[PDB]
Amino acid sequence: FVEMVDNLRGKSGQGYYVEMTVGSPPQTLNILVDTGSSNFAVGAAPHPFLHRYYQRQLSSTYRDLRKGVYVPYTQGKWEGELGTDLVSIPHGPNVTVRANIAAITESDKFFINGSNWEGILGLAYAEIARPDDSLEPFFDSLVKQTHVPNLFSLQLCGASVGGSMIIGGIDHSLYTGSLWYTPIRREWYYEVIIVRVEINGQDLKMDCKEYNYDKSIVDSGTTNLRLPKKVFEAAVKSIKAASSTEKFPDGFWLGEQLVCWQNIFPVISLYLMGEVTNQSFRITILPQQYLRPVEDCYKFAISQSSTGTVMGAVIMEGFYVVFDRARKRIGFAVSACHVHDEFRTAAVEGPFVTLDMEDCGYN
Ligand SMILES: Nc1nc2ccccc2cc1CCC(=O)NCC1CCCCC1
């Protein structure tokens, strides 16, 4: 899959994008890779932020679905006109599919000023597609229409970021050690179950049901590791107790200010439900994952949420992540490109014994 190695680019804090082509003749666009949404949506109008946009008038293969789509969120919106057209990934499988495309015609706080992407590829399942679950997501169309195996994997490496999206397979050069798999609880977001959290090896002794209130997802379209508040404060409570060589204001635990140089911070381990009854594994991240530079200087990349846990780039940049859709599971392995110092490396370890892992899920 050497074709697809290094097929992801971006800028710190602006997401990871892949090159795609839409229409005939092919129109090239940079498209954010997003495992926390399910719409393939592209700029279709000359927004001043945009390098380029989908020009439906130039495409002989374009078909109008004569239906609009309105997507409000926190805190912005995009909206557009639904159609289908021919889609390829130049540095992906050597195929071309007819996919749904939302031509974005109005937008608010969606596109980033200074970014190099013009659209978004929702890689999650139809249940969270807009307007409804009848709009077939891109990856579903891809798997149906070709012989591309029903999985993809992401190596996000982290001004310019790099990475790999391996479509239809796994490149073993992108990781070391073994992959460990956690069940996809339900096919809407990439939902998983966290069963135990350790700050510096120390348990948080919270009812594990709290770690998944009301869900926990894997999301390449989110920068931070995001935790339910009730879990977040207990997590912060421990993190700032483990960090007592220096002092930091309560505004920073959001965060606001920056440490600036020319070990005091604890490692973080999430235990995830395993493939076998009463069996789990753990993924361990460094401070060099939840301490992100802005523009030796760093910010605090863990924050609170009301929609559940979000395993974003903070988590994902330490690991090679396999979205094994065919077997309803997600694999984690230590990434070959993750950033480590001489004292600590990010880790994926198992098996561990954990009882009552079902009680950790919220219904
Ligand atoms: N991953 C993401 N991608 C996004 C892309 C555009 C606007 C908002 C986004 C938010 C997230 C965070 C995950 C999330 O809350 N997803 C729920 C809906 C939000 C509306 C779009 C479909 C998915």
Phi, psi of 209 (to 5 degrees): -65, -25
Count CA atoms closer than 13 A to 97's CA, side-chain side: 22
Ligand 1: centre distance to CA 155 (Å) = 21
List C-alpha distances in Å: 67 to 59, 76, 81, 84, 108: 19, 21, 6, 11, 20
222 lines ligand 1 (CB under 6 A): yes
CA atoms of 264 and 203, how far apart (whole Å)? 18
Same fold, 16-148 and 149-363: yes
Q: Name the residue of 17, 31, 37 whose CB sits within 8 Å of the most ligand 1 atoms, as the mutation to test its pocket.
A: 37
221 lines ligand 1 (CB under 6 A): yes
Phi, psi of 6 (to 5 degrees): 70, 20
137 lines ligand 1 (CB under 6 A): no
What residue owns the CA closest to ligand 1's atom 18?
A: 37
Q: Which residues touch 228 (CB under 8 Å, ≥6 apart)?
A: 210, 211, 213, 304, 305, 306, 308, 309
CA atoms of 23 and 141, how far apart (whole Å)? 16
DSSP label of 306 = S
Domain definitions of the chain by residue range:
16-148, 149-363
Q: Which residues pair with 1 in a beta bridge?
A: none
What residue owns the CA closest to ligand 1's atom 22?
A: 37
Ligand 1: centre distance to CA 37 (Å) = 5
What residue owns the CA closest to ligand 1's atom 7?
A: 73
15 lines ligand 1 (CB under 6 A): no
Phi, psi of 19 (to 5 degrees): -75, 135
Which ligand 1 atom is nearest residue 130's CA? 22
128 lines ligand 1 (CB under 6 A): yes
219 lines ligand 1 (CB under 6 A): yes
CA atoms of 65 and 54, how far apart (whole Å)? 16
For the beta sheet containing 268-273, the strands, ordered from the edge strand earlier in sequence to the opposite edge, are: 202-203, 194-199, 268-273, 279-285, 347-353
37 lines ligand 1 (CB under 6 A): yes
Task: Report the 10 Å Cβ neighbour count for 305.
Answer: 17
Ligand 1: centre distance to CA 46 (Å) = 23
Which SS3 state, helix, strand or coil, does residue 131 take? Answer: coil
CA atoms of 214 and 189, how far apart (whole Å)? 12
For residues 184 and 275, the answer to whether their CB atoms sit within 8 Å is no
Structure determination technique employed: X-ray
The separation between the first and the last C-alpha atoms of the chain, rounded to the nearest angstrom, is 39
Domain 149-363 class, CATH top level: mainly beta
- Tell me which residues are annotated as active site: 34, 219
120 lines ligand 1 (CB under 6 A): yes
What residue owns the CA closest to ligand 1's atom 23?
A: 37
CATH dotted code for 16-148 = 2.40.70.10
CA atoms of 318 and 307, how far apart (whole Å)? 23
Ligand 1: centre distance to CA 128 (Å) = 9
Conformation bin of residue 109: beta by default, left when phi > 0, alpha when psi is -120 to 50? left
